[PDB]
């Protein structure tokens, strides 16, 4: 199983508030976070999220891998509290927040638990078929899903940019957690919306077809900038 990860400012943003982590030693879990907030930032929130989810998983994986939904929920809440605590304390960064998408693999490696809060995404790629696993926690996504406003078509409405869920909120209840089964040759992609605001699903699928995940990850980031690079962009590419 090969894995590559990459982050980039883009061509507009002066700093990168994205963060990611790959479990290089054991390849059990993978994390991408997209921060927001100034003063700064932002980068604080997404760093906290990645660090706390990582440390919670590291500590409790042995004990709780039989119950991944409980494990992932507690990891996310650990992250959420760490951010809220740094908020409640610090006035300037009181509104800092971040997305997170996490993949946790079962020990066997045939099953992946996908957990997320926000509009960062997880995709699975299998035999030239690209499938978005996570559903965006945005107002307009959840609108289209209902509907109406089921024109897609969705953005550009003003938001688009506005999240219905993010880490760093005392009012956090919804954490989406779902299992997906894996097959040899599948690719997994974790990405911030810096990727998917620039690249259509069709384009992403092309780049995920490259067996070399190092080249694939670099291609994705490079393509996102060619198309505009209006935001921070982060990708983690996993070959199953």
Q: Which residues are annotated as a binding site for Mg(2+)?
A: 34-35, 119, 183, 193, 197-198, 227, 231
d(CA 79, CA 85): 10
Among 8, 23, 34, 43, binds Ca ion (CB under 5 A): 34
Which lies closer to Ca ion via its Cβ, residue 98 or residue 239? 98
CB of 63: closest distance to Ca ion in angstroms?
A: 33
Which of 5, 194 has the CB closer to Ca ion? 194
The least distance separating Ca ion from the CB of residue 103, rounded to whole angstroms, comes to 19
Is residue 23 at the binding interface for Ca ion, with CB under 5 A as the rule? Answer: no
Enumerate residues 39-78 that contact Ca ion by CB under 5 A: none
Least Cβ distance, residue 30 to Ca ion (angstroms): 18
Rg over CA atoms, the chain: 17
Give yes or no for residue 165 binding Ca ion (CB under 5 A).
no
228 binds Ca ion per the rule CB under 5 A: yes
Contact call for residue 227 and Ca ion (CB under 5 A): yes
Scan residues 87-126 and list those touching Ca ion (CB under 5 A).
Answer: 119
How far apart are the C-alpha atoms of 235 and 221, rounded to whole Å? 7
Count the residues of the shown chain that bind Ca ion, applying the rule CB under 5 A.
Answer: 10
Nearer residue to Ca ion within complex by CB, 23 or 34? 34
Of 17, 80, 196, 239, the residue at the interface with Ca ion (CB under 5 A) is: 17
> Candidates 78-86, 125-133, 167-175, 224-232 — which segment interacts with Ca ion by CB under 5 A?
224-232
Contact between 7 and Ca ion by CB under 5 A: the answer reads no
Q: Does 8 bind Ca ion (CB under 5 A)?
A: no
Residue number, 23 or 43, with CB nearest to Ca ion: 43
List 125's β-bridge partners, or say none.
130, 187
Q: Which residue is nearest to Ca ion (CB)?
A: 228
- Of 46, 53, 110, 99, give the one whose Cα is nearest residue 76: 53
Enumerate residues 6+ apart whose C-beta is below 8 A from 127.
Answer: 185
Q: With respect to Ca ion, which residue has the nearer C-beta, 13 or 73?
A: 13
**Applying CB under 5 A, does 193 fall inside the site for Ca ion?**
yes
C-alpha 161 chain-centroid distance: 15
List of residues contacting Ca ion (CB under 5 A): 17, 34, 36, 119, 193-194, 198, 227-228, 231
């Amino acid at each position: 199983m090969d894995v590559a990860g990459l982050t980039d400012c883009g061509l507009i943003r002066k700093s990168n508030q994205d963060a990611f982590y790959i479990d290089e030693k054991h390849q059990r879990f993978f994390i991408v976070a997209d921060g927001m907030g100034g003063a700064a930032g932002g980068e604080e929130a997404s760093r906290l999220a990645v660090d706390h989810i990582r440390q919670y998983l590291e500590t409790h994986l042995e004990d709780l891998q039989h119950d991944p939904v409980t494990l992932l929920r507690q990891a996310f809440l650990a992250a959420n509290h760490a951010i809220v605590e740094q908020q409640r304390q610090n006035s300037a960064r009181a509104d800092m927040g971040t997305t997170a998408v996490v993949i946790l693999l079962d020990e066997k490696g045939d099953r992946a638990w996908c957990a997320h809060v926000g509009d960062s995404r997880i995709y699975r790629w299998r035999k030239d078929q690209l499938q978005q696993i996570t559903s965006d926690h945005t107002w307009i996504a959840q609108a289209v899903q209902l509907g109406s406003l089921t024109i897609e078509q969705a953005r550009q409405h003003p938001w688009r940019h506005v999240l219905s869920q993010c880490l760093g909120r005392e009012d956090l209840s919804q954490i989406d957690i779902q299992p997906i089964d894996l097959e040899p040759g599948d690719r997994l992609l974790l990405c911030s919306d810096g990727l998917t605001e620039e690249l259509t699903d069709d384009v992403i699928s092309i780049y995920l077809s490259e067996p070399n995940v190092q080249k694939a990850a670099a291609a994705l980031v490079d393509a996102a900038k060619t198309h505009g690079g209006r935001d921070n962009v982060t990708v983690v590419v996993i070959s199953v």
